[PDB]
């Protein structure tokens, strides 16, 4: 429909889901559709739990974690959430700088200056711009739906998306990166039945978009052993079979628009979680990381990995408020929803501690 499609294109609209989904296509091919599916499946549950808690308690999670918790724990949780928003803005700025160097060839620091003046221009109105960004992201989604029809190994795609298996540090690392990019703390911190159905259908169609992106990054070059896998400059140059000369600039414009939109979205979310200036303190790490002399191709995925590092500090407080009687009243969430959410909370920490043990080994 017109509602859910635009809602999905706006709600995902980030360079993290773009970068982490192309890495998985050229490192483990179709064997990461399981990661994508599990990610969206738990993201919808987290969205529903967050909405239920926010409505039945009358406050967002930043306002709640200030009610009943020790002050040092509040400081530690603010450290965690501010590092989360910081990494989100870092990923935004990195994706935008890469898109700018792909479009006009400007170096990533001049691209950061351009993104700063675009943030200045965010404040010839908001009505005309909201259609353009959503239209660009919807067009790139249709472009990848154009390609998902050509993947010859249908049953191989199904079998690789069906059987979950991880092998070594790279597989678990990229899986954690993707599952932390999809399930975002923005989602965790986000006619009621209409809103619920719209969000569910939107996230479902956007999960289809992500599966299409991963399957295309797998079928375009998996065994071709092309020069680079996750270099979004090399990705953009070979991303697409169809409508070639315009496809490269289309991909670059889509990346730039998604980055500039996620900029405002995540920055306003950080302002919400912070007041209950802001743009510069969350921007400085982006500049110091892209100036340190390292290519952003791997840091754009490490940022999603760190967002997954930050997901449990936003997941543990949710269910404790969810399961309560003197607050939820007669509208307490079921015990089975609780059990499913807690199995998910155990699984995420299992994967993250797996990666951490593998890093401790060396």
């Amino acid at each position: 429909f017109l509602g859910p499609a635009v809602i999905a294109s706006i709600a995902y609209m980030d360079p993290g889901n773009f970068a982490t989904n192309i890495e998985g296509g050229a490192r483990y091919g179709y064997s990461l559709l399981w990661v994508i599916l599990a990610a969206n499946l738990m993201a919808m549950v987290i969205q529903n739990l967050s909405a239920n808690l926010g409505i039945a308690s009358g406050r967002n999670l930043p306002e709640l974690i200030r009610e009943r918790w020790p002050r040092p724990l509040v400081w530690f949780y603010w450290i965690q959430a501010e590092l989360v928003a910081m990494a989100t803005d870092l990923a935004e700025f990195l994706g935008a700088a890469l898109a700018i160097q792909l479009l006009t060839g400007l170096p990533m620091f001049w691209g950061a200056v351009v993104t700063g003046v675009v943030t200045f221009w965010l404040l010839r109105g908001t009505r005309p711009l909201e259609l353009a960004v959503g239209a660009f992201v919807l067009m790139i989604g249709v472009a990848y739906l154009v390609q998902v029809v050509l993947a010859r190994p249908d049953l191989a795609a199904v079998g690789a998306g069906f059987v979950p298996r991880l092998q070594g540090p790279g597989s678990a690392y990229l899986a954690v990166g993707i599952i932390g990019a999809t399930v975002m703390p923005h989602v965790i911190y986000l006619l009621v039945r209409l809103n619920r159905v719209d969000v569910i259908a939107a996230m479902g169609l956007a999960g289809l978009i992500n599966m299409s992106m991963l399957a295309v990054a797998a079928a375009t070059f998996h065994g071709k052993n092309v020069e680079n896998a996750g270099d979004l400059t090399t990705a953009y140059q070979t991303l697409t079979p169809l409508l070639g000369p315009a496809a490269s600039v289309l991909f670059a414009v889509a990346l730039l628009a998604s980055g500039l939109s996620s900029s405002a979205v995540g920055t306003m979310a950080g302002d919400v979680i912070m007041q209950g200036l802001r743009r510069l303190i969350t921007m400085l790490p982006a500049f110091i990381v892209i100036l340190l002399g390292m290519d952003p191709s791997s840091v754009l995925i490490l940022s999603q990995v760190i967002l997954c590092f930050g997901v449990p500090f936003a997941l543990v407080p949710l269910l404790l408020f969810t399961a309560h009687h003197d607050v939820m009243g007669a509208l307490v969430t079921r015990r089975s929803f609780t059990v499913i959410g807690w199995v998910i909370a155990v699984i995420i920490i299992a994967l993250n501690g797996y990666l951490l043990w593998e890093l401790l080994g060396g």
Partner: antibody, heavy 114, light 108 residues
Framework: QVQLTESGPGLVAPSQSLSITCTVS????????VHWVRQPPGKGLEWLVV???????TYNSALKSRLSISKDNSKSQVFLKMNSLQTDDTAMYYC????????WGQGTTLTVSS | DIELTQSPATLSVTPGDSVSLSCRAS??????LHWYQQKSHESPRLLIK???QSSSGIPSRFSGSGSGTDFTLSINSVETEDFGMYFC?????????FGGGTKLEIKR
């Protein structure tokens, strides 16, 4: 200087077993997926199989359920293995992978007759 | 299941006249091709990645020309070190498929 080398030629009876070592040097084997190519003398050649690093074996429909591909990252070797050999499987085997399939092995000869 | 038929089967020429091999496809392959030269009892080095992006360390003699379902590799001013086998391979969809092959020989 990047360089791939292979195992010495082999002469085996039918219904026997065999393995061939494709050892690499100069590049990171754990970062590139190796492809196999079978060429009988003058009889043309067709793409055989690909072992992407970390054990990801994908076989073609032409040669499936008979061949196997092991990998040993400790010495960076790719093992080709065959069981229940037939008469007309004699050929030279190649293993080749660096970024656009540039580097090929010198080739290992393999003959099967009683 | 996509195959590749190569023409001609064998080709004779004297040093000086340009040659051109055609690697006809079974369906549309979006500029996914590979050209290899080979000698007797040797290993084939890579010449042409996808189409006419002359590979690493390849003389400027060889040039590709690419379009959907029919690609052509041409050698201008054939020197004595260009005779032997030539092979064409697609790399888009499993399984990869090599062409019918050609053996460029000497003419007199």
């Amino acid at each position: 200087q990047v360089q791939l080398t292979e195992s010495g030629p082999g002469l085996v009876a039918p219904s026997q077993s065999l393995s061939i070592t494709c050892t690499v040097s100069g590049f990171s084997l754990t970062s590139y997926g190796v492809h196999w190519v079978r060429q009988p003398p003058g009889k043309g050649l067709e793409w055989l199989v690909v072992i992407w690093s970390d054990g990801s074996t994908t076989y073609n429909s032409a040669l499936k359920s008979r061949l196997s591909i092991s990998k040993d990252n400790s010495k960076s070797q790719v093992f080709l293995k065959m069981n229940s050999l037939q008469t007309d499987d004699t050929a030279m085997y190649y293993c080749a992978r660096e970024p656009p399939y540039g580097y090929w092995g010198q080739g290992t000869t393999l003959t099967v007759s009683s | 299941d996509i195959e590749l038929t190569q023409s001609p089967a064998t080709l004779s020429v004297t040093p000086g006249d340009s040659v051109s091999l055609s690697c006809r496809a079974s369906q549309s392959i979006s500029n996914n091709l590979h050209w290899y030269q080979q000698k007797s009892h040797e290993s084939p080095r890579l010449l042409i990645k996808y189409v006419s992006q002359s590979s690493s360390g390849i003389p400027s003699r060889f040039s590709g020309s690419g379009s959907g379902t029919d690609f052509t590799l041409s050698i201008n001013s054939v020197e004595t070190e260009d005779f032997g086998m030539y092979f064409c391979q697609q790399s888009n969809s499993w399984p990869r498929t090599f062409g019918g092959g050609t053996k460029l020989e000497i003419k007199r």
